Design a protein around this ligand. Structure first.
Ligand SMILES: [K+]
Ligand SMILES: [K+]
Ligand SMILES: [Mg+2]
Ligand SMILES: [Mg+2]
Ligand SMILES: [Mg+2]
Ligand SMILES: [Mg+2]
Ligand SMILES: [Mg+2]
Ligand SMILES: [Mg+2]
Ligand SMILES: [Mg+2]
Lengths: 102, 67, 141, 206, 107, 145, 145, 141, 63
RNA sequence: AAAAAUGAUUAA
RNA sequence: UUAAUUGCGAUAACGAACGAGACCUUAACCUACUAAAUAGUGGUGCUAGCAUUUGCUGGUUAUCCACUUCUUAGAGGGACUAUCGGUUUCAAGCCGAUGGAAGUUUGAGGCAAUAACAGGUCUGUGAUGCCCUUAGACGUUCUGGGCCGCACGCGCGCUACACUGACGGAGCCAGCGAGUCUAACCUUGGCCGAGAGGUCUUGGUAAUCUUGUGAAACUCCGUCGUGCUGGGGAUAGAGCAUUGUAAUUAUUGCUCUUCAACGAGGAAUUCCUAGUAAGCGCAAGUCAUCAGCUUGCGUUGAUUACGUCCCUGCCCUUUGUACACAC
């Protein structure tokens, strides 16, 4: 076919090297979301108060409705199951399902 | 598609015009007859010949057939 | 001797062989009771003969199963096919067949695979692709 | 009722399922009664299944898949988005959890909720592309019952998967929320809003 | 030598199925005409030896592959015969493409 | 299942080895921010410090944080089998060492300057800015190097 | 010396061996005999020997530098299936000439009705036994000895 | 009545027996615990620093009970797994030979296994007795 | 909402540029003397029930 | 009834 | 009408041939024959170890015997769209249901016509014409280097962007293979080592041993907690080993450290209809060492469609042509 001249090949290579990274996407980022992994007194009172009347209890709903990390959600959830104010339905790792007691 | 080839068609037609009184309407004994009234190299083609023969015999029972 | 029979059940490449003989109603699989079969998300499939026919008539019969081959799920299917086949073959050989056919009716009423192994077979792979049908990515220009 | 002794102990909970088949040994298929017509004999709630896993042949015929149980049909469409091809054990476990979450958020049969979600999420009218010119057009057409229930399962599973991607909420929980939203009709669910958009487009191309 | 037992074993290895079965059947026959108790011919799984290679001698064209195969059919027979007749069976009934291997087992 | 009630004595973001270790992250993965320490080294140092592994890097008292600093400073003197370190048997003194936050890129400069001042092929490839571990360069690694 | 033997035995139906015909034709081309005569002669010899069909292909450069390939055929000659491996025998031979290399391809269909090994007829060749037509007797006419 | 370690849940049997050895405290921990990562395929040590050795000891002892004889290399192929090789695919890598060897060597020190004059390591009478005691207690947990 | 429930009684044929649309004849459930020809996207048997958002249009793309 | 231009010389 | 120049048939054609089919291999079905410590199972018949009103294991063709269900290979049987209900120039045929292991030629292949391409290969060939070269060789060997070189562009791919996840503990499962005596091949097991590995023996010329290739994806139980994060593991530093005479331009493996782009990807474009797609690994080929490749093997196992000629093409017929180097 048509061979390009050396100057044209150099121009193309230099253009490719100078070229910026054309990311072909719209990059939208959500804002910083923090959850108090450390459990202070006010958050514990909020737990002991409003965790009852919750129709559905799980790590995700504890995270969404209360700014606590998944680790604190899991340990506090098992603590509430020990206190017996929530009864289980399906017991399984990676997914917990809990409702009101009695 | 289950269109039979001319080898099956002509073998069946000759068998009908050669052993019509002995041939019987069910497949199993037409199979067990073709081994003695013919020599087919393969069991598969023997079964295909017997099946076309018994289908034509069903056709022959309710009226004649051209050819 | 003791009244006994034996059967087998087959998935893709898994095979389970069942020794079925009269006793006190003892069920084991690979020397383990069938209630311990893993996974517990598919332990129901091996429970299904126990829940369909009704374990009331399992009192006289005892079954011991040795299963090999295939994967975990393929073993589950071969076990449940083998236990169903053994139960209905023990009925055919040593019981009146009114109960044999009613078992067969209930089994076919639930799944055909309880008695008849799946005829699906692995398809050999062909050159030019990773699988039997799939091809390597063609390139033009 | 009336458990019998056995030489090998059978657990009491599974002993009660001898009476009739009980999905996950927790619900029976009796009194499901898919109420919106034109989807009967296509949503399979008559034959009971103990679990959503049975390797039956439902692809060698055109309409054979309609006889596959509706729960397993939903399960087999959760085995995605490529990395999740296979792992039907995982999909069945997710289905079991999402039905449990239905039965704890609503005093309703989860199968009833699922079939109501499918009936409410199957589009009744769509379009098709006609015209080879540069300005190609759409023509509204009716939608068969089978395609309605297939598109309903697709939109429910896809919306649950997208809502599960990159957030703290488990797939089982976001699928349960999607199913609860769809079984009543709330337009906060992906499948409802997608169906309503598509039907509106067929209306505009009528 | 004084008409005693050898605990002899005979292996037949070949690709030719018919040329293998005929010799094995003849050995079986000579057993009964000399009222000989034995183990019948145990047939090994038919070994297959495959070679897959490109058909093209150069490196051009569609990447078509071809596979060629051996089939090794094997039969081991455990015989318990006197000394004066193990030679009678081993020197006769030999066919082209088929070889006979004999080991005095002691296990 | 321990549900601990504590006052406002939780220690928020804290400084070790001239590096910002932030609380609310487990102590192992909080220490990994320091240059020269990875997940394995952080785990081993934390475990040799006789502290709990679930202290969120904010419950650590001062004294048990200087214990962990000294363990990082002298890895060998706390029964580490010495194949676990970062710089074993160096050119200068041949003593098995582990570089820390501000010293990893310093020792990197010293080693690169040494290889350049000796004109060894790896040093000259580094000076040009090419790949030194023997990779092909025809197509891959273009947009930056 | 005295245990290894070598026996040479005469080839019957020598027209049916593609190897022998290919060698003989190659010697004809070396001797200078015309290509069309050599191929038609070997075909005639094969067919008169009793083989069902014959095939001789001469590929190379015959009159001009530009290549071509004649073909000489006769009789019945199948091309696909197991009977290729069961009734077809082929030979390929190179022929040095001044201009170049000529390829000689010989393919032979031997008559299935002959020989005592393998199939004695082609697959699907169905043959029927004659009915031996007889007269029906009217009366029973039971017989005794 | 009679019960052995085949009718109990394997995972709960392993955990309970590991805690039983934890209470006995005679397993003679190797010393390089708190360091090793148990397999070349792994990239992290066990998250339970104080019991992973006891868990491995129970699992190995159970596995030896399961089979006729099992060697160190067979434990290595067992307890090994996939290894992440960065931009390369995965492959199976055997477990730490030294750890598997030390667990086995600890087993005869606690007396459960013997030389196995034909093969590798096999279960003894006293070890059998200790396992079926923990089987009885685990069953009546 | 006036949604119309109609039972198919005949499949006329496979229509469309790519053949993705079905020509069907449907009678109405409330009165079985109100036959009309419609276009259906998905697969259809006989004796299947459809839902019609507008119940008055005749399907084009005949013969 | 949407749009659709081009293709160097010689070589049975 | 068929997948078919497959047939029904019509007929200035008649009878024929090749191809298609038929054929051969291979995955399925055989409680039917032959059998088997190189495949098995069972009798616990011999001793026993454990728990205890009976189950699980150790030594079983000299510590025995019986039987081929599982396994293998010989000869076969089996399916022929069988029967039935529909439809037809009522013929070839096609659509449903019932049986059956199997009802898209049952699945997948192997072979595969005449005619041609200035298709590729003279670097596979002691296949080869002609031209060139032939002692300072374009011959053949030896040392070193290169074939890998990087401003750049493109085509196969691998790993990813994560919670349907990562990490840790445990449960625990294939099929196809291959493998030394003209010499070190496949390696059990024991011991040392974090590991990679090292050392001492063993078995296997192989359904006997590696090997039940105890593979991975998978399942359970815990840690993480939506943060380019503990996702990802590029780049780079330091050390320890193996192959090989020889490892620097890093063969590869292992340990610690560094921890980059990458937030699901514009125009555009590839493969695929059921045990298929896809995910997952394993073996073999090349191999002294080296897989991100290929050829197979099994594991887990979708969705959607049973259609059309819209796009891209193919076959037959009719037609137009100023084309035949053939739009
Ligand atoms: K695949
Ligand atoms: K050289
Ligand atoms: Mg053919
Ligand atoms: Mg494993
Ligand atoms: Mg031109
Ligand atoms: Mg190259
Ligand atoms: Mg990181
Ligand atoms: Mg390659
Ligand atoms: Mg033009």
């Amino acid at each position: 076919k048509q061979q390009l001249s050396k100057a044209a090949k150099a121009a193309a290579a230099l253009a490719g090297g100078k070229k910026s990274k054309k990311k072909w996407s719209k990059k939208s980022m959500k804002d910083r979301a923090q959850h108090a992994v450390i459990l202070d007194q006010e958050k514990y009172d909020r737990i002991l108060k409003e965790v009852p009347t919750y129709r559905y209890v799980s790590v995700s709903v504890l995270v969404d409705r209360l700014k606590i990390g998944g680790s604190l959600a899991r340990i506090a959830l098992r603590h509430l199951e020990k206190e017996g104010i929530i009864k289980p339905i399906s017991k399984h790792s990676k997914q917990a399902i809990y409702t009101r007691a009695t | 598609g289950r269109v039979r080839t001319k080898t099956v068609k002509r073998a069946s037609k000759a068998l009908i015009e050669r052993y019509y009184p002995k041939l019987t309407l069910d497949f199993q004994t037409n199979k067990r007859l073709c081994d003695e009234i013919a020599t087919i190299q393969s069991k598969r083609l023997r079964n295909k010949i017997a099946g076309y023969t018994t289908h034509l015999m069903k056709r022959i029972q309710k009226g004649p057939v051209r050819g | 001797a003791v009244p006994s029979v034996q059967t087998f059940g087959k998935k893709k490449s898994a095979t389970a062989v069942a020794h079925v003989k009269a006793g006190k109603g003892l069920i084991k699989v690979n020397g383990s009771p069938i209630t311990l079969v893993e996974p517990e998300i598919l332990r129901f499939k091996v429970y299904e003969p126990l829940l369909l026919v009704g374990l009331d008539k399992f009192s006289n019969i005892d079954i011991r199963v040795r299963v090999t081959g295939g994967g975990h799920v393929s073993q589950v299917y071969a076990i449940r096919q083998a236990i169903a086949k053994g139960l209905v073959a023990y009925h055919q050989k040593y019981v009146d067949e009114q109960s044999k056919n009613e078992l067969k009716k209930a089994f076919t009423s639930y799944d055909r695979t309880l008695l008849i192994a799946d005829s699906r077979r692995p398809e050999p792979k062909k050159f030019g692709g990773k699988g039997a049908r799939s091809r390597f990515q063609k390139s033009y220009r | 009722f009336t458990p019998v002794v056995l030489a090998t102990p059978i657990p009491e909970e599974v002993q009660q399922a001898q009476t009739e088949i009980k999905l996950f040994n927790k619900w029976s298929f009796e009194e499901v009664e898919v109420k919106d017509a034109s989807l009967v004999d296509y949503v399979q709630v008559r034959q009971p299944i103990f679990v959503a896993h049975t390797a039956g042949r439902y692809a060698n015929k055109r309409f054979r898949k309609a006889q596959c149980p509706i729960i397993e049909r939903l399960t087999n469409s959760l085995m995605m988005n490529g990395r999740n091809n296979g792992k039907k054990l995982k999909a069945v476990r997710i289905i079991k959890h999402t039905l449990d979450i239905i039965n704890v958020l609503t005093d309703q049969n989860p199968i009833q909720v699922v079939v109501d979600a499918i009936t409410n999420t199957g589009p009744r009218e769509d379009t098709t592309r006609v015209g080879g010119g540069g300005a190609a057009r759409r023509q509204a057409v009716d939608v068969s019952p089978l395609r309605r229930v297939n598109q309903a399962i697709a939109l429910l599973t896809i919306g649950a998967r997208e809502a599960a991607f990159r957030n703290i909420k488990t797939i089982a929980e976001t699928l349960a929320e999607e199913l609860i939203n769809a079984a009543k009709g709330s337009s906060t669910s992906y499948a409802i809003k997608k169906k309503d958009e598509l039907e509106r487009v067929a209306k505009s191309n009528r | 030598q004084q008409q005693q037992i050898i605990k002899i074993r005979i292996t037949l290895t070949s690709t030719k199925v018919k040329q293998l079965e005929n010799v094995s059947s003849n050995i079986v026959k000579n057993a009964e005409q000399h009222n000989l108790v034995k183990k019948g011919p145990v047939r090994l799984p038919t070994k297959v030896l495959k070679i897959s290679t490109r058909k093209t001698p150069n490196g051009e064209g569609s990447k078509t592959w071809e596979t060629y195969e051996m089939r090794i059919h094997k039969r081991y027979i455990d015989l318990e015969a006197p000394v004066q007749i193990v030679k009678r069976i081993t020197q006769i009934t030999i066919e082209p493409g088929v070889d006979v291997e004999v080991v005095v087992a002691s296990n | 299942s321990l549900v601990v009630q504590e006052q406002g004595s939780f220690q928020h973001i804290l400084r070790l080895l001239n590096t910002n270790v932030d609380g609310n992250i487990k102590i192992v993965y909080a220490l990994t921010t320091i240059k020269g320490v990875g997940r394995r080294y952080s785990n081993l140092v934390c475990k040799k410090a006789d502290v709990d592994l679930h202290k969120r890097a904010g419950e650590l008292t001062q004294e048990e944080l200087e214990r962990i600093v000294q363990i990082m400073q002298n890895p060998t003197h706390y029964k580490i089998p010495a194949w676990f370190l970062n710089r074993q048997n160096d050119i200068t003194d041949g003593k098995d060492y582990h570089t820390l936050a501000n010293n990893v890129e310093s020792k990197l400069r010293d080693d690169l300057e040494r290889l350049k001042k000796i004109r060894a092929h790896r040093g000259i490839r580094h000076f040009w800015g090419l790949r030194v571990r023997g990779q092909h360069t025809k197509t891959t690694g273009r947009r930056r190097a | 010396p005295g245990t290894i033997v070598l026996y040479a035995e005469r080839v019957q139906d020598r027209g049916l061996s593609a190897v022998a015909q290919a060698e003989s034709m190659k010697f004809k081309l070396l001797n200078g005999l015309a290509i069309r005569r050599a191929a038609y002669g070997v075909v005639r010899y094969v067919m008169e020997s009793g083989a069902k069909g014959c095939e001789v292909v001469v590929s190379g450069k015959l009159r001009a530098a530009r290549a071509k390939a004649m073909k000489f055929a006769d009789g019945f000659l199948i091309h696909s299936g197991q009977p290729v491996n069961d009734f077809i025998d082929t030979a390929t031979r190179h022929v040095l000439m001044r201009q170049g290399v000529l390829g000689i391809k010989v393919k032979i269909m031997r008559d299935p009705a002959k020989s005592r090994t393998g199939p004695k007829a082609l697959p699907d060749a169905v043959t029927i036994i004659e009915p031996k037509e007889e007269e029906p007797i009217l009366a029973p006419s039971v017989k005794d000895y | 009545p009679g019960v052995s370690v085949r009718d109990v849940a394997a995972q709960d049997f392993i955990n309970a027996y590991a805690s039983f050895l934890q209470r006995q405290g005679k397993l003679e921990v190797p010393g390089y615990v708190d360091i090793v990562k148990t397999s070349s395929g792994n990239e992290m040590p066990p998250q339970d620093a104080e019991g992973w050795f006891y868990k491995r000891a129970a699992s190995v002892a159970r596995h030896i009970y399961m089979r006729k004889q099992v060697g160190v290399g067979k434990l290595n192929k067992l307890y090994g797994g996939a290894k992440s090789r960065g931009v390369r695919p995965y492959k199976h890598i055997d477990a730490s030979g030294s750890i598997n060897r030390k667990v086995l060597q600890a087993l005869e020190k606690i007396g459960i296994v013997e030389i196995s004059p034909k093969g590798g390591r096999r279960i003894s009478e006293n070890g059998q007795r200790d396992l079926d005691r923990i089987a009885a207690q685990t069953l009546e947990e | 909402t006036p949604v119309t429930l109609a039972k198919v009684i005949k499949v006329l044929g496979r229509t469309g540029s790519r053949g993705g649309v079905t020509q069907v004849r449907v009678e109405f459930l409330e009165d079985t003397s109100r036959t009309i020809v419609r276009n259906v996207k998905g697969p259809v048997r006989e004796n299947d029930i459809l839902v019609l958002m507008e119940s008055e249009r005749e399907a084009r793309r005949l013969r």
